[PDB]
Design a protein around this ligand. Sequence first.
Ligand SMILES: *[C@@H]1O[C@H](CO)[C@@H](O[C@@H]2O[C@H](CO)[C@@H](O)[C@H](O)[C@H]2NC(C)=O)[C@H](O)[C@H]1NC(C)=O
Ligand SMILES: *[C@@H]1O[C@H](CO)[C@@H](O[C@@H]2O[C@H](CO)[C@@H](O)[C@H](O)[C@H]2NC(C)=O)[C@H](O)[C@H]1NC(C)=O
Ligand SMILES: *[C@@H]1O[C@H](CO)[C@@H](O[C@@H]2O[C@H](CO)[C@@H](O)[C@H](O)[C@H]2NC(C)=O)[C@H](O)[C@H]1NC(C)=O
Ligand SMILES: *[C@@H]1O[C@H](CO)[C@@H](O[C@@H]2O[C@H](CO)[C@@H](O)[C@H](O)[C@H]2NC(C)=O)[C@H](O)[C@H]1NC(C)=O
Ligand SMILES: *[C@@H]1O[C@H](CO)[C@@H](O[C@@H]2O[C@H](CO)[C@@H](O)[C@H](O)[C@H]2NC(C)=O)[C@H](O)[C@H]1NC(C)=O
Ligand SMILES: *[C@@H]1O[C@H](CO)[C@@H](O[C@@H]2O[C@H](CO)[C@@H](O)[C@H](O)[C@H]2NC(C)=O)[C@H](O)[C@H]1NC(C)=O
Ligand SMILES: *[C@@H]1O[C@H](CO)[C@@H](O[C@@H]2O[C@H](CO)[C@@H](O)[C@H](O)[C@H]2NC(C)=O)[C@H](O)[C@H]1NC(C)=O
Ligand SMILES: *[C@@H]1O[C@H](CO)[C@@H](O)[C@H](O)[C@H]1NC(C)=O
Lengths: 50, 170, 133, 35, 197, 49
Amino acid sequence: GLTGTGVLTESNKKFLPFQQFGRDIADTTDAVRDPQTLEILDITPCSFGG
Amino acid sequence: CGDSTECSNLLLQYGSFCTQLNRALTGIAVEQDKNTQEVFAQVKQIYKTPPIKDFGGFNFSQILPDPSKPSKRSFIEDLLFNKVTFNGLTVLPPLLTDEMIAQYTSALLAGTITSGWTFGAGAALQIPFAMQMAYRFNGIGVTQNVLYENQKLIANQFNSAIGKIQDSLS
Amino acid sequence: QTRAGCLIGAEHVNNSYECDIPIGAGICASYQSIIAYTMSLGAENSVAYSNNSIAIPTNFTISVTTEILPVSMTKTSVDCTMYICGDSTECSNLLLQYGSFCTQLNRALTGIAVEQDKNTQEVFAQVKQIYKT
Amino acid sequence: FNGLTVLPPLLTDEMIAQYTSALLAGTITSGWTFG
Amino acid sequence: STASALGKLQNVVNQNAQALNTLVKQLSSNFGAISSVLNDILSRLDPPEAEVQIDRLITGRLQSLQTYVTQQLIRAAEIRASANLAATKMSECVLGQSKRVDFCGKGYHLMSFPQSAPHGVVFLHVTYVPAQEKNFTTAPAICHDGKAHFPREGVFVSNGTHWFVTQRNFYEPQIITTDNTFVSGNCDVVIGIVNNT
Amino acid sequence: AEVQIDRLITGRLQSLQTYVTQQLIRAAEIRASANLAATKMSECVLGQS
Ligand SMILES: *[C@@H]1O[C@H](CO)[C@@H](O[C@@H]2O[C@H](CO)[C@@H](O)[C@H](O)[C@H]2NC(C)=O)[C@H](O)[C@H]1NC(C)=O
Ligand SMILES: *[C@@H]1O[C@H](CO)[C@@H](O[C@@H]2O[C@H](CO)[C@@H](O)[C@H](O)[C@H]2NC(C)=O)[C@H](O)[C@H]1NC(C)=O
Ligand SMILES: *[C@@H]1O[C@H](CO)[C@@H](O[C@@H]2O[C@H](CO)[C@@H](O)[C@H](O)[C@H]2NC(C)=O)[C@H](O)[C@H]1NC(C)=O
Ligand SMILES: *[C@@H]1O[C@H](CO)[C@@H](O[C@@H]2O[C@H](CO)[C@@H](O)[C@H](O)[C@H]2NC(C)=O)[C@H](O)[C@H]1NC(C)=O
Ligand SMILES: *[C@@H]1O[C@H](CO)[C@@H](O[C@@H]2O[C@H](CO)[C@@H](O)[C@H](O)[C@H]2NC(C)=O)[C@H](O)[C@H]1NC(C)=O
Ligand SMILES: *[C@@H]1O[C@H](CO)[C@@H](O[C@@H]2O[C@H](CO)[C@@H](O)[C@H](O)[C@H]2NC(C)=O)[C@H](O)[C@H]1NC(C)=O
Ligand SMILES: *[C@@H]1O[C@H](CO)[C@@H](O[C@@H]2O[C@H](CO)[C@@H](O)[C@H](O)[C@H]2NC(C)=O)[C@H](O)[C@H]1NC(C)=O
Ligand SMILES: *[C@@H]1O[C@H](CO)[C@@H](O)[C@H](O)[C@H]1NC(C)=O
């Protein structure tokens, strides 16, 4: 139910056993936990620029 | 808008609204670059210091660049650098990297150590440091005899002050 | 691939000249084809320092240089109601309920014009009489 | 134009040229004394 | 011959013209209404909806005019600062000779001449630049008869065999005499003193 | 939904305008400081004041 775009990579963050996703600052999500495999993935925005 | 065709279509009817915003931001960036270039680019040649350093007893080792460090900075510059520490927004890098700024500072400092104020008008002319300091005292109403009789004490006081500056900063 | 991004359509060399078209991160490009290089701060020299040697000029030259400074700009004014409504009684009646909205703008524009006139008169009028050669 | 006006400057360029000529003749003939 | 030298005045003129052009161009925006023409809206609907339509145009045009006024204020402040700098330069480098280095000209200042420009001033600065240097050997004081001699103004120089006194900014040797030197102490504490007559 | 989209758009535009104005003011004061620094570098390093 949490929707967003970007590119997903493998991360090394250690979620405490009851969170579902994390955000760093200014309320922007960075890490998520896949509901099935139960691992932490990292999201970075798709490349853009002038 | 953020990837919304409907938002873009509704927004298109507001006319030229962000063209002037980008114009202003580009002007600000150009002004920053111009400010840096105006402040630091004041010499035409990159002067260097002789390998042998006997400046009448004065000691500039704390301010001269250090060849050992890769950044080619000095003690005070390293202390200053160490002491102080998106949804469509980008940050552009400065045109002049800090290595070139350090090179400009080193060139200016070598020029003012070796050639007095002469390099600021025309070509640099060499001068022993004691004579330049005698000129500087003569320019404030004190005869050069005072420096020529108190050189050692003057050098010791200068070294002590430049040593205390580093401790005060650190 | 540069610290400023990615660049296509130019060749990278190993020399260094004065910077023509600034690109960024200490590098920029020029035309010869188009070549991208690292900026050169200036010429290199090592002034001959010794503790019992000096250099003294023997001749001189006289140079004349220019400096350009702007001191003024055009004075403009804007009629608020004519621009925002344009000969419409209904528009004026609807706009009237906004309070004092354009009096401040006219005040600011008049101040700007007065400042331009003061700038010009202060910069140039610095003599009491009109001397003649 | 739809309600915008441009006002002429108070000092026409002839007077500015006269000021420059007076200043320049003064500095040629009298040095810095006239300042 | 060379053009593109009067960049600043042209830039100011272009900025003003562009601001005026965008301000007058902003008049053709719907701003979310049905049309940009006032009479067309007036002669197509009923007043209860007509006023709703007109409000959007009113607020949009007000916002644009506010932005234009703010930009004009900023540019006027910058122009005022530039004019103050120009006035200071005119006061200090035309009515007198300046000692502060590099304020007006590159070198030792001699004089300046003003000229007008459509929206500014042009200063012609005349400066003195030394050239054709030459190496010499120097000494800070002269020991003679057990006394130390220092130059009044100038510096001791040497052909390579003899010694002379010169002014600092132009080579003109002269014979060392008691008239252009003064005595203080004895030649025992000065580092680098040399023997002569 | 177009009404809500417009309501969001106007506020976002207002915020962008405020940020731009603040940046302009800060740039002006920074430029003044840079001019002072350049004058000091020219007058106190290249000569005696
Ligand atoms: C959801 O169901 C899948 C399907 O069985 C589970 O995936 C298996 O998990 C076990 C646990 O070690 C592995 O040994 C199997 O190899 C997995 N099978 C696959 C990936 O096809 C998964 O663990 C379940 N998730 C839960 C229960 O949270
Ligand atoms: C100039 O001052 C520096 C101190 O910053 C001197 O360097 C010290 O030299 C002594 C004696 O050789 C060493 O014991 C210290 O470890 C040095 N300090 C540092 C930080 O390197 C330097 O010798 C002085 N210059 C001269 C010519 O004596
Ligand atoms: C002054 O004397 C020096 C030393 O004899 C002359 O030679 C220069 O010496 C410096 C350092 O020793 C070198 O960096 C230069 O390349 C030398 N110049 C030449 C042409 O060989 C020097 O030419 C003399 N004149 C001046 C104006 O310095
Ligand atoms: C100082 O420089 C000037 C300018 O170069 C010299 O005047 C030149 O002298 C040569 C040879 O006599 C002439 O061919 C040139 O026409 C002169 N130039 C001008 C502009 O008249 C002058 O000789 C130099 N002084 C010394 C002592 O060398
Ligand atoms: C030292 O300076 C003196 C004075 O200019 C030079 O000596 C003169 O040389 C000329 C040419 O040989 C003679 O005609 C004069 O009689 C000399 N003057 C005296 C007082 O003897 C001398 O050339 C300079 N030294 C060097 C190495 O050039
Ligand atoms: C200027 O530098 C020279 C050379 O570095 C110094 O000359 C030295 O003087 C001492 C004591 O008189 C001698 O022991 C050395 O042998 C000299 N050096 C050479 C290479 O011969 C001189 O002392 C310095 N200071 C001056 C001239 O005031
Ligand atoms: C300048 O002259 C004085 C005296 O003419 C020299 O002083 C003599 O130095 C020698 C060698 O050191 C001593 O043996 C004498 O006793 C000294 N005489 C006196 C009266 O003190 C002095 O050395 C000369 N200067 C130089 C640089 O050689
Ligand atoms: C010269 O430039 C080429 C590519 O432009 C680079 O591969 C090389 O390392 C540079 N230096 C030398 C010494 O060839």
